[PDB]
Amino acid sequence: PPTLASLQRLLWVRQAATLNHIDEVWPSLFLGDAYAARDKSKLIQLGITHVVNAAAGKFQVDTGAKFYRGMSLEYYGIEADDNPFFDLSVYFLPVARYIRAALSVPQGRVLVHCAMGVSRSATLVLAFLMICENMTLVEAIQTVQAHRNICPNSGFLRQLQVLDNRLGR
């Protein structure tokens, strides 16, 4: 039963020197920022077929389905705030189902992006790994941080920590 303080240490302790705009943190599952989400060329190059925008809203990254009209990808917008009291857990299961289905397809290439692809987005991926990949919160973080510096809100961590106890049983 990892403590919150522990999880935080784990996150900061093993960080790489730099952070790219996007990284494949799991086979065909990418974590990225708003710069990558708006770069259509890049998305076409990586063959992205699905985009989960965890920072939707006209006051955040207002891309939306319209933005990808030409490309033939699936859009999933989530109006989430990145503060420790926002309830992101309510999207853990529906997003995990969404990722799973997308990755069950040969072409399937999923990009989960935040404004910085380090908190909201990362939290959804961790939830996906825990739920569909049978990983504990610890294993999930280890899996992802080996490919991208991530740092979910202390609140998101608390939520993931609660998910971990639920899945554990």
Side-chain angles (χ1 to χ4, degrees):
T3 69
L4 190 65
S6 288
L7 295 175
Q8 302 185 301
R9 285 178 152 188
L10 175 55
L11 291 172
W12 120 281
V13 170
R14 297 259 55 178
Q15 290 207 188
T18 67
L19 180 80
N20 302 309
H21 289 120
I22 181 168
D23 301 290
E24 188 175 4
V25 302
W26 180 250
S28 293
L29 218 194
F30 305 71
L31 267 174
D33 56 39
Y35 177 82
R38 289 179 169 290
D39 185 351
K40 293 172 190 173
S41 167
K42 177 169 298 185
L43 269 41
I44 298 165
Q45 289 189 308
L46 294 168
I48 283 47
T49 62
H50 290 72
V51 174
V52 176
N53 175 13
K58 60 158 57 186
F59 298 128
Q60 299 192 297
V61 299
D62 188 60
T63 48
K66 314 282 187 178
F67 188 79
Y68 305 105
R69 186 159 66 185
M71 317 152 93
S72 195
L73 57 70
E74 308 309 309
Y75 181 79
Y76 186 159
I78 299 178
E79 295 185 54
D81 303 338
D82 182 27
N83 69 275
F85 294 91
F86 180 81
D87 192 348
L88 191 57
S89 76
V90 73
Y91 300 92
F92 290 176
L93 200 65
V95 167
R97 288 205 187 81
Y98 186 89
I99 305 294
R100 188 219 293 135
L103 299 178
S104 66
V105 145
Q107 311 89 310
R109 256 58 163 177
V110 176
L111 165 60
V112 180
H113 83 81
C114 171
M116 288 304 293
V118 160
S119 179
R120 276 169 295 187
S121 57
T123 297
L124 297 179
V125 169
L126 294 174
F128 164 74
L129 296 179
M130 293 166 70
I131 301 174
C132 310
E133 252 45 58
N134 194 217
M135 291 191 196
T136 61
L137 210 190
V138 171
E139 304 170 315
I141 290 166
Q142 288 173 161
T143 297
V144 178
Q145 69 179 177
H147 294 92
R148 185 186 179 68
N149 291 167
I150 60 167
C151 191
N153 290 321
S154 58
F156 290 172
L157 284 180
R158 174 52 181 168
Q159 289 165 50
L160 284 179
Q161 199 184 18
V162 169
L163 180 63
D164 193 54
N165 171 98
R166 244 217 177 207
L167 294 184
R169 183 188 63 189

